[PDB]
Point group: D2
Chain length 296, copies 4
C-alpha cells in the first residue's frame, strides 16, 4: 500500500482505555481563551513523568455556540487513573483557568460519552470562602466565585468518559526537516478532528519510547533504539534519517482512527517522506489495535 508514493506499513497502533474529561474554556477573546488553554494543558505530554495528558481539541468555538456568548476553545485532559484525573481537573482548572484573565470553564463532554461525573465547580467554589453562589446559565448549573477581577464562572459538574489513549503513527523521512514539515501538516489535519487531541509539544514526539530499558532497572521507559538513526543496529529502512511519532488521544476509537487517517494523509502530501509505521506492543498490553491498512 502507498499513499502518494509513500509506503504504508502493514502494522497497527496499540492503544489503551483511559479516563478523560472535556472542558470548554471561554474568555473575553480567543487570545485570552488560548492564554488559559496553554497554561492548563502544559506539563501534560505523557503520564510517564507528567501529571496528565492534555491538549486542545477545538481551537475555535463560535461565541454563538457557547453558554455565555463569548469566544471559546475546547480542551481534553486524560489519565489512566480516574482519581488522578479528578485531581488534575481540580488543579488545572483551579490554578490555570480560575487565575486566567476573564476565562470561564464549562463541561464539554458529549452526552453519549458521559459515564461518570466530577463536581469540579462545586469543589472549586469553596475558594469563595462562603461568598460563592450557585446560579443557572443557559440551562447549566454554575458556580459564581468572587475573585478580585469580579467573578469566576465554573460549571458545577464535568462528565468523565473512558476514552482511547496512545493512538499513533510514525513518520519516517529522508531528513529531520522533511520529517518535521510532514509532522506539522499531520497535526494541522488532526486539529480539525473533534474529540481528539495530541498531547506532545506541537502534537509531535521527537523521542518515542519503548517500555523499560535493556541496560538499566530503574527506568519505566527508554529510547526506542530500534528507530534511532544514530544507533548502529537500528531497524530503519535505507534512506530514513529521521523518525517522528504523532500520539493521539480521543473520546472514542472512531475519533482516534479519524485523526490517524487524516494525519497520515496530510503527512504523505509533504516531500521527503519514506514510509509510515505505527507503534505497538505486539498486542500484549492494549485494549485497542488500529491497523493502518484498515484506515485507507
Amino acid at each position: 500500500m502507498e499513499i502518494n508514493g509513500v509506503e504504508i506499513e502493514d502494522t497497527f497502533a496499540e492503544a489503551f482505555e483511559a479516563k478523560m474529561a472535556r472542558v470548554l474554556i471561554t474568555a473575553a477573546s480567543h487570545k485570552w481563551a488560548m492564554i488559559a488553554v496553554k497554561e492548563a494543558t502544559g506539563f501534560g505530554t505523557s503520564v510517564i513523568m507528567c501529571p496528565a495528558e492534555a491538549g486542545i481539541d477545538c481551537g475555535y468555538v463560535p461565541p454563538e455556540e457557547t453558554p455565555d456568548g463569548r469566544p471559546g476553545v475546547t480542551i481534553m485532559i486524560g489519565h489512566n487513573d480516574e482519581d488522578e484525573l479528578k485531581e488534575q481537573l481540580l488543579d488545572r482548572i483551579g490554578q490555570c483557568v480560575m487565575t486566567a484573565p476573564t476565562a470561564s470553564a464549562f463541561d464539554a463532554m458529549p452526552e453519549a460519552e458521559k459515564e461518570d461525573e466530577d463536581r469540579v465547580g462545586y469543589k472549586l467554589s469553596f475558594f469563595g470562602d462562603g461568598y460563592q453562589e450557585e446560579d443557572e446559565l443557559d440551562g447549566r448549573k454554575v458556580w459564581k466565585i468572587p475573585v478580585v477581577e469580579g467573578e469566576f464562572i465554573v460549571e458545577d459538574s464535568f462528565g468523565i468518559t473512558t476514552g482511547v489513549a496512545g493512538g499513533n503513527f510514525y513518520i519516517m523521512a529522508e531528513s529531520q526537516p522533511a520529517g518535521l514539515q510532514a509532522a506539522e501538516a499531520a497535526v494541522d489535519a488532526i486539529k480539525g478532528v473533534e474529540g481528539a487531541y495530541a498531547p506532545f509539544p506541537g502534537g509531535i514526539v521527537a523521542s518515542a519510547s519503548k517500555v523499560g530499558s535493556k541496560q538499566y532497572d530503574f527506568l519505566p521507559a527508554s529510547t526506542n533504539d530500534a528507530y534511532c538513526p544514530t544507533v548502529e543496529d537500528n531497524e530503519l529502512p535505507e534512506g530514513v534519517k529521521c523518525v517522528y511519532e504523532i500520539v493521539i488521544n480521543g473520546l472514542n476509537e472512531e475519533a482516534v482512527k479519524e485523526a490517524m487517517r487524516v494525519g497520515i494523509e496530510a503527512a504523505c502530501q509533504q516531500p521527503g517522506v519514506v514510509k509510515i509505521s505505527a507503534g505497538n506492543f505486539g498486542g500484549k498490553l492494549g485494549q485497542y489495535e488500529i491497523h493502518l491498512h484498515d484506515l485507507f
Copy 2:
C-alpha cells in the same frame, strides 16, 4: 505619590526565598523553541496546587549568542523546596523539551547566582539506554541522547540559585477591560527585564488569594475577599470595579524590583487605572519587603 495621575499606595510586596533554575531552550526556529517553552512552563502558576512556578524569561535569544548557533528562549522554573525543583527540572525537560521537535536544553543560570547544581543532563542521558554519549559543545559538557528524530542535546548540569518569589503589585481599575489593558501593558514591560518571570496565565492573576479560609478548615488558600468587587464588605476605593495582580519571581531582589518598577510604570500609562497597591502578609511571613514608594 502619583504616576500619571494614578495613586501609588504606600505599602509593600512581601516576597520569599525560593529555589530557581534558568534554562536556555534552542530549536530549529523561534517557533519550535516557543513550542517547547509553552509545554515546559505550563501547569506552573503557583505551588499552591501546581507542581512548580515557571515562565519565560527572555523571549528572544539571538542565534549568535547560543552554544549551538540556533534561535533560543530562556525560561525559569522555581519551587520553595530544592528537591521538588530538581524533580520538576527532570520532568519538564525530559517530558516537554526532550520530546519537543528540534529543541535542546542548556544551562542559563548566571555565574554569580549559581549556588548549587543539578546534573539534569546526566540523569536524562540514561534514556539513551547505553547509547548516550558525552561531548563538549562550545565549552559546555553536554549529553547526546539518541532519539528517533536524531539526537537530544542537553547540558550535563544546571545551576540552582536562591531567588525571590512573590514580588507583586495590584492594579485597581474602573472596569475589568481597563484593568486587563493596564495589566497586559505591565507584562509587556516585564518581558524586557532579564532574570524575572511572571508565572500566571499571560503573567496576570485574576483570582488573588489569602492564606487559609475564614469559613473552612480544609483550604490552604481562598479568595482575597477584601479586594473582591462583588463582595459587600470589600475594602476597595470608590470607583474600583476590577482588580488584577501581577506576580513576579526573579533571580534576585533587584530583578524583581525592576520588574515591579517597569510594570507599574507601564500600567499607569493605560486609561481607567485608579490606584496601584501590593500584596503582603504584614511582614510576618516573607524574607523580602519591596516598598512601592521606594521604586519611584
Copy 3:
C-alpha cells in the same frame, strides 16, 4: 430592543455593490499559509488610500478539503472598480503568494456567485519564461511555474462576483478599553462567518470617516466628528467615551448581514458597552440598507 442591556439603535448600515474575488491559499503548514495571507491582504483596509480592501475569510481549511491535501486559508480581495480588482489579484498573488514559501493559490469563489473570470494564473504563468506547464489538479486547471524553491502552483482562472462592501456597526462604550474588548469579541464572531471579511486592522476601525470634509476641498474623506469623544459639539450619548466601527465586506448581502448579527451579539456580551449604532448616508445612495432591528 436590547441585547444584554445594550441599546440597539433603530437605524441602518448603508452598503454598496463592490467587485470581489476569493482565493484559497494552501501551504506546507497553517503557519506558512498565514505568512502568505498576511502579506497578500495587508495595505488593504480601504480604497480611500489603499490599493484594495482585503482580509482573511476562513482561518482554517482542513487539508482533506483542499485540492492538494495541504493546510489552507481563504482570503477575499475587493474593489469598487473591476479592472483595479484584476490588477490587485495579479499584484497580490504574484508578489505576496508566489514569493511566499510553499504557498499555492486556488480559486475559492463559489460557483453560484461567479459572474466574471480573471485568468490570474495564466497571466502569472509567463514568469516561467517558457518552462511553465499546464496541468490538472483535483479537477482544476492549474499552472506549474518553475521557481527557485521548486514550483508555484496557481489555478488558471479566478471567479469575480459583485459582492457587498461597507456593512458596518458602531460600538459605543464607557471607555476605550471597554470598546476594544467588545470590538475584538465581535471580530472573533465575524471570523466564523463564511464569505465575510473585515478589512481594517484586526477588523476594527479606530478612526471612522465621513464623505469629504467641511473645511478642506482636497479631501475625499475626513473624521466623523459627531462621534469623536474629544470633539466639543459631538452627538455622542453622555457616558460614551469611546466609539469603534466594525466594517464588513462580503460575497453577498446575507454574509454581510450575518457578520453584522453575530458581531453585535458578541460585542453586547462584553462589559461597558452603552449602545450599538450603524453608519449610513440617509438611504439615498447605497444599493443595500441593513436595518439593525431586522437582524435579531
Copy 4:
C-alpha cells in the same frame, strides 16, 4: 571558505541606493502594535509590482524607551523614488496605523541618517477637520487628531534617508524542507539586527527572479531558471533540490552587511544545506557590492 560544512561561494550581493523611512508604532499592547504593523507593512515585498518595500525592523521596543511609555515596534518602508516613498508613508500610516486600535506613529529615523523630512503627521492632521491640535510629547512635535476612538497621535515630521536595498544571499539545500528550515533560522537572526528588514513573506523569497526573459520578448523579469531545480538545464550543483533567497534592505550598508552575516551563519547551522551564494548584476548596475568572503 566553509561554515559548518557549508560552502560559501566567493561571490557578491549587488545592492542599490533606495529611499527609506523608519517608523515607531506604539499601542496599548505589543499585540495591537503588531496588528497595525502587519497591516502597514503588507503588500510590500518588492517595488516590481507592490507599492513599496516594507517590513518590521525591531519586534520589541520596551515601553520605557517610547515617547508615550507604551509598548512599541519599529518598521521600515522603502522605495527607489522619494516622491513615491512620501506617498507610501502617508497612505500606510493614514490607512493602516491611524485606523488601527490604540496605535500611534512616531519618527524612528536616527539623526545621523536623516537627509530629508516628510511632514506626514502635518499632512494627516487635516483629517481632524479643524479640531486637530499640535502638542509636544517627550520633546517631539506631534499632532493630536480627533478620532471616534479618542485621538490619533502622530509626529509632525518623519526623516528620510538614502538607505540600501537588495542585499541578499541564496540558500542552496538538499530539499525544500531543509532549505526552509535554514531560511527561517536566518530570518530569526536578521530580526535582531537593528536598521535592517526583510520585505518578502516571512523574510524569504521562494521565487527569485532574473533580469529579462529567454522565451518572451515582453517580460522585464522571469523565473531565475538557472536556479530552478525543475528546469532541466539549470546551473545548480548536483544535490541541490531547493533554493531560497533572503532579500535585505537597511538604513545603511553596515546594517545590510550585518543582516547578511548573521543570517548566513544561522542558516549554516541547520541540516541539509549544501552552499550559500548571492545575486548580482555583473557589477554594472549597483552602487554596492557585498562580498560574501568579506563578512566572515
